[PDB]
Amino acid sequence: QEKDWANLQRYAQQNAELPKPDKNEKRVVFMGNSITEGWVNTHPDFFKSNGYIGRGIGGQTSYQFLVRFREDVINLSPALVVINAATNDIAENTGAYHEDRTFGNIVSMVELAKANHIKVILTTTLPAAAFGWNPSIKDAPQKIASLNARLKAYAQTNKIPFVDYYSSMVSGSNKALNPAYTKDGVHPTSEGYDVMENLIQQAINKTLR
Amino acid sequence: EKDWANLQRYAQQNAELPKPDKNEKRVVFMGNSITEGWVNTHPDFFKSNGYIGRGIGGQTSYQFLVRFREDVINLSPALVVINAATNDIAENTGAYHEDRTFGNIVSMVELAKANHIKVILTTTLPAAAFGWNPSIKDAPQKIASLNARLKAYAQTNKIPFVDYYSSMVSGSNKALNPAYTKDGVHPTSEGYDVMENLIQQAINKTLR
């Protein structure tokens, strides 16, 4: 029996010390994995200067995101949640990859957000040629592209903003994360996050306008 | 490989199930070993009514949530019956937090409604103690508190709430009635007879 499988302990104390948002406040929570966690670690001031809350946890899949969605998103009373998911689903961090199930987990998070009157921005899974921690995955590019196409369509089907980090960050015939934006092929550097900030800021301002 | 929520348990079964007709009134039962054991003990209750059992022994509400889409939503049921939390309180997947366990059940309800599936909520069954985890000394207090909270939630949101607990509890220690169990937790045939009468009426009322 694996205890605290979704790592609710990671943000439990932080969540407890967050006051309810101010009357006029439009609190934004970023849900994700090490790309979202690393965003806060690399550009802490992007979050602090905008009032944004980072709830990324390294290594996690969409299955784990769903289990902690109520505690790390809903209970913070955000105006908006930004969801970036599936890098680790495709890396098979919690088991074999099934696009239908990973996609379904993202849909579940959307449905929970809307049930609680939280707006949603969906985003593309970032490009990766391969994963250093799991080299057995030889078809990440095919899987990432297929999931992103499906998420794009779902977003349009339900009038949800969809932010395309992927198209601004992909390079080469192998659909690698651009070497200008990464050192390990997966996690953005400062320059990569600069690209993501420009894109997400505009979408957030538009949606909360 | 890893499969923390045991999606493999019903994967093949789910895949072979044709889409229902509205008039078929497909009902799915979500739960743990109490729901799994229901099918094992009275298979004809399920077969003769066209009910689908999706219980998995040992599981907590956290695991239920992970497999909810695959084992409930994708079956396009008219109705889902949820019985949960026995193993949350037994701490099968970690320390018990009523807020989180309750929240998992609310999440399942919200997902069901988002997909136009009706819901029947049910009381966690009484248990004085759990044989597999004797360190839990306050199960009665925790079960009663969660059931009170589920009852209030159900009434606030006009969701039928089936009180297995009041028909099955006995003694000052709030044990599962010895007439209905051999181990203090899992119902026998006679216990399931009580549950069938209660749930049938609620299902017929909700789908009429």
Whether B125 and B147 have beta carbons less than 8 Å apart is answered as no
Burial of B99 (0-12, 13-18, 19+ CB in 10 A): exposed
Partner-chain contact B104 A66, CB within 8 Å: no
Secondary structure (3-state) at B29: strand
Phi, psi of A111 (to 5 degrees): -65, -40
Method: X-ray
- Neighbour tally for B83: CB within 10 Å: 25
Question: Per the structure block, which two tokens stand in for A117?
Answer: 């009157």
Residue-level length of chain A: 209
| Exposure on the CB side of residue B13, measured as CA atoms within 13 A | 11
**Residue the block writes with tokens 């449905």:** A111
CA A116 to chain centre: 19
Which residues are CB-contacts of A209 (< 8 A; sequence separation ≥ 6)?
Answer: none
Min Cα separation B38/chain A (Å)? 24
Q: For residue A177, what are the β-bridge partners?
A: A170
E strand or H helix that includes residue A171: strand A170-171
In angstroms, the first-to-last Cα distance of chain B is: 44
What CATH number corresponds to the domain at position A13? 3.40.50.1110
Residue B93 to residues A158, B3, B82, B86, Cα–Cα distance (Å): 35, 14, 19, 12
Question: Per the structure block, which two tokens stand in for A174?
Answer: 């192998």
Secondary structure (3-state) at A65: helix
Which residues are CB-contacts of A196 (< 8 A; sequence separation ≥ 6)?
Answer: A39, A165, A169, A188
Partner-chain contact A95 B2, CB within 8 Å: yes
Burial of A100 (0-12, 13-18, 19+ CB in 10 A): exposed
Q: Residue A96 is part of which domain span?
A: 1-209
Nearest CB partner across the interface for A71, out of B7, B100, B114: B100
State how far the Cα of A168 lies from the Cα of A177, in Å rounded to an integer.
10
DSSP state of A182: B
Interface test with B, best of A70, A105, A106, A160 (most B CBs within 10 A): A70
CA B61 to chain centre: 9
Partner-chain contact A63 B4, CB within 8 Å: yes
Partner-chain contact A67 B68, CB within 8 Å: no
Fill in the amino acid letter for B8.
Q
- Please name which of A25, A28, A21 lies closest in space to residue A123, comparing C-alpha atoms: A28
E strand or H helix that includes residue B109: helix B98-114
E strand or H helix that includes residue B64: helix B61-71
Whether B71 and B54 have beta carbons less than 8 Å apart is answered as yes
State how far the Cα of B140 lies from the Cα of B138, in Å rounded to an integer.
6
Partner-chain contact A8 B93, CB within 8 Å: no
Residue A80 to residues B27, B181, B182, Cα–Cα distance (Å): 35, 48, 50
**Residue the block writes with tokens 């008219």:** B78
* C-alpha dihedral, B132 to B161 to B108 to B91, nearest 10°: -20
Whether B72 and B80 have beta carbons less than 8 Å apart is answered as yes
In angstroms, the first-to-last Cα distance of chain A is: 46
E strand or H helix that includes residue A42: helix A34-42
Secondary structure (3-state) at B43: helix
Sheet holding A28-32, edge to edge: A53-56, A28-32, A80-83, A119-123, A162-163
- For residue A65, what is the nearest residue in chain B, using CA coordinates? B66
Q: Number of A:B CB contacts under 8 A?
A: 65
Q: What is the largest CA-CA distance in chain A?
A: 50
DSSP state of B179: G
Whether B110 and B102 have beta carbons less than 8 Å apart is answered as no
Min Cα separation A69/chain B (Å)? 9
Rg of chain A, C-alpha, whole Å = 16
State how far the Cα of A105 lies from the Cα of A90, in Å rounded to an integer.
13
Pairing type for strands A28-32 and A80-83 reads parallel
Resolution in angstroms comes to 2.0
State how far the Cα of B30 lies from the Cα of B126, in Å rounded to an integer.
18
**Residue the block writes with tokens 């248990």:** B127
Q: Identify all chain B residues contacting A114, using CB atoms and an 8 Å cutoff.
A: 114
Could you tell me the sign of the dihedral formed by the alpha carbons of B96, B5, B19, A151, in that order? Answer: positive
Pairing type for strands A119-123 and A28-32 reads unpaired
Q: Identify all chain B residues contacting A76, using CB atoms and an 8 Å cutoff.
A: none
State how far the Cα of B184 lies from the Cα of B173, in Å rounded to an integer.
11
> How many structural domains are present in chain A?
1
Could you tell me the sign of the dihedral formed by the alpha carbons of B146, B95, B66, B60, in that order? Answer: negative
Secondary structure (3-state) at B16: helix
Q: For residue B53, what are the β-bridge partners?
A: B29
Partner-chain contact B5 A95, CB within 8 Å: no
- Neighbour tally for B139: CB within 10 Å: 24
- Neighbour tally for B70: CB within 10 Å: 20
